[PDB]
Chains A and B, each alone.
With several copies, the nearest count.
Chain A
Amino acid sequence: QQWFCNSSDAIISYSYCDHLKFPISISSEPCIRLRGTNGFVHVEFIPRGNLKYLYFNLFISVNSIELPKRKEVLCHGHDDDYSFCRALKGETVNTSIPFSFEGILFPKGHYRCVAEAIAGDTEEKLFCLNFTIIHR
């Protein structure tokens, strides 16, 4: 319900989590095509942690078959590559990150991903998102 885009071959949607509702606005340009894409992802929110040791826990599910759990490090403290690694709790963050991906084949079906952002220094959850992708 929060946000959804229809690409050429994908339908992407997200909604808030259930045990955490901390606002965050996020979108992309253009709507991703699981057949390889290259574009930008826009973010806007107000942290509730220091964003200095920020990483993600991803719980993914393909056609109801849980993969293992993924952990993606985004900032690590020492001369990070992104400008927002230096925001503080209460400080408006508003940015656009570039990305590209290509070369993998994805099984058709229905995917789900629960992506929760953790402040690594204190182990608190900054937010939790409930994603839903349908590849056709």
Chain B
Amino acid sequence: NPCIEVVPNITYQCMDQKLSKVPDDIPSSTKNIDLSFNPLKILKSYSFSNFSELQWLDLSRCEIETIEDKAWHGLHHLSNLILTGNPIQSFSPGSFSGLTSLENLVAVETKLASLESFPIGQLITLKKLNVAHNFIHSCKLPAYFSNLTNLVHVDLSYNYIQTITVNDLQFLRENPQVNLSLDMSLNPIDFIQDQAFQGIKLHELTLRGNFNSSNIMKTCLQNLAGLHVHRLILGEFKDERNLEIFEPSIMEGLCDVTIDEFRLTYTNDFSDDIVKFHCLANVSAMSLAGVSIKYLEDVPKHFKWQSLSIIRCQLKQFPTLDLPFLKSLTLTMNKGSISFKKVALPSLSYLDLSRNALSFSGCCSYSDLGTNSLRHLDLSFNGAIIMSANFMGLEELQHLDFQHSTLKRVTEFSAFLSLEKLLYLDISYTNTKIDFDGIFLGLTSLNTLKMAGNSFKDNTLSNVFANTTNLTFLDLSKCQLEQISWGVFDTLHRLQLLNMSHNNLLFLDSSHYNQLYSLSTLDCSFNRIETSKGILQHFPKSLAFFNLTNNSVACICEHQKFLQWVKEQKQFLVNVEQMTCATPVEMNTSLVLDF
């Protein structure tokens, strides 16, 4: 093997060694081979015969210039074949013959010329096909596609396509069942012959970076009448020529196309009027990703948007919305610091405002979001929430998430007092000095707490888990606890995971945990324990995992009973192997006294 093995007898990464033929010493039963940048120049018959187990082959930038007839003879389970870069100008017939399970052929930048002289007629398993950057000149789909039954994506990006005609996409008219997904980004389209799309149905169509003239784009878009698409993606690219003036009148023509989800990506010049165009009213799922919008002031009330997404878009002010049909609004990773504004969305059932600097001063009031049916709220990674109400109207919430925000005023009263049916709370890393034993009152159905970077008063775990019976996963890690008050955990009859790592405990007790009937993991490492006071036979036997690593257990005959129990019931402990002691002498594992 003149190349580096990654895994024993599997995944032989052989990239960029001066080779001129696949190595002969590579073991069979291998699964992933990578011969990239090696200076091969021709494939030869049967060369891959013994690899009747290979299922991922990559030949990129090898200077393959021709192919022998029975090149890929013995390959029977190969699924992914990549061929980027090789200047195979003409694919003479009978190539791709031996392949019988290929699922993803990539032929980017192989100086192709046309999609008809491409002998793939018999590859009846091909899912994807990628021929971008390939000199092609005509969108004409070839007839043999009728044979490639299970083909669901074609990528023609960055080709020389110039015009579309009625006899192209003919296949798609005669075959109203093919579930195809087209793509033609970066093609200098300038003339869509009239009636081109008629009775045609695609599942997606990208057109980013095509036009650089306003009127050309206007008329071309106009000619799409009759199409019926499930996701239309428009926009431009930053590092290319693009329109300097964008006006909602360009959207003309789209006013008779059955769009189902309209996505609009980056655009050089953008006027907030674009989105308020009279023939988006039937779109079902708006979307914006990168457009430098400023104010989403006021959209008509007959719009039928059922969804709305704004991701990485700049904003200077929380939009104002009244859509009586919108549900599942999403505004994420915004590029500014905005403050929440009151809205009226009678049908909202999914809200997500993460990763912004959303300072939300008033809080948990139905008056802030006129929806009696919210089910998923998320305000993670935001700036500074300020609690001033206990979800008086949001009594359907089932998923709440306040991570990394500065959660202020939550200890001053029973917040969460009305969330009687909630399943996933998360308040980790919100600096929250728990100093009130009613803070979690009302959460009768919670199942997953997550507080990590939160303190307590006196560094003592207070009794804050009453009336939280159904808790099943509880994470107290990374708090700086120093002792556990007596009586905690005394009613968590279903807790199954109890994380407490990275605390500053001085020792361990077993009188605790005595009522955790269902416990199964008790990670208690990195917290500098010395021993385990109390009778050591009251732990639940259901414990399967017990971290005791990065501890400081002293094996100077300190609690000989414990020093024996630790090396006796070790089929549960984790990494019993390297259990060092911390009282001279160290480097040990067993104590002399048995039984």
Contact = CB atoms under 8 A, between A and B. Distances in A.
A and B in direct contact, judged by CB atoms within 8 A: yes
Given A82-B239, A90-B109, A91-B85, A62 B133 contact: no
B390 A104 contact: yes
Contacts of B233: 79
A91 B86 CA distance: 10
Contacts of B238: 81-83, 97-98
Contacts, number: 91
Contact of A83 (B60, B240, B367, B418): B240
Contacts of B132: 86
Contacts of B106: 88
Most buried by A among B237, B239, B240, B411: B239
Contacts of A98: 238-239
| Chain A binding surface SS class | loop
Contact of B237 (A83, A91, A103): A83
Interface in A45-86: 46, 48, 62-63, 65, 67-68, 70, 78-79, 81-84, 86
B237 A90 contact: no
Contacts of A84: 239
B61 A90 contact: yes
A88 B418 CA distance: 45
Contacts of A82: 237-239
B325 interface: no
B53 to A, nearest CB: 23
Nearest to B85: A90
Nearest to B288: A79
Interface stretch (B20-28, B276-284, B435-443, B516-524): B435-443
Given A79-B233, A103-B365, A107-B414, A89 B60 contact: yes
Chain A interface size, under 10 / 10 to 19 / 20 to 34 / 35 or more: 20 to 34
Q: Which of A79, A92, A105, A107 has the most CB of B within 10 A?
A: A79
B36 A86 contact: no
Contacts of A97: 238-239
Given A62-B438, A67-B436, A98-B239, A91 B108 contact: yes
A82 B242 CA distance: 13
Nearest to B436: A67
Interface in B89-124: 106, 108-109
Contacts of B289: 78-79
A15 interface: no
A107 B133 CA distance: 45
A95 B84 contact: no
B535 interface: no
A96 interface: yes
Contacts of A65: 436-438
Interface in B419-461: 435-438, 441-442
Contacts of A95: 239
A79 B233 CA distance: 9
Nearest to B365: A103
A65 B106 CA distance: 47
Contacts of A86: 132, 157
A23 B61 CA distance: 14
Contacts of A89: 36, 60-61, 84
Interface string B229-243: 000010101111000
Given A91-B109, A91-B133, A79 B265 contact: yes
Given A67-B436, A81-B290, A82-B237, A90 B84 contact: yes
Given A68-B435, A79-B289, A88-B108, A103 B239 contact: no
A81 B436 CA distance: 34
Ordered nearest first, which 7 A-B pairs have the shortest CB separation?
A: A90-B85, A90-B60, A90-B61, A90-B84, A83-B237, A81-B266, A79-B289
6 contacts: A81-B265, A81-B266, A86-B132, A91-B84, A104-B389, A107-B438
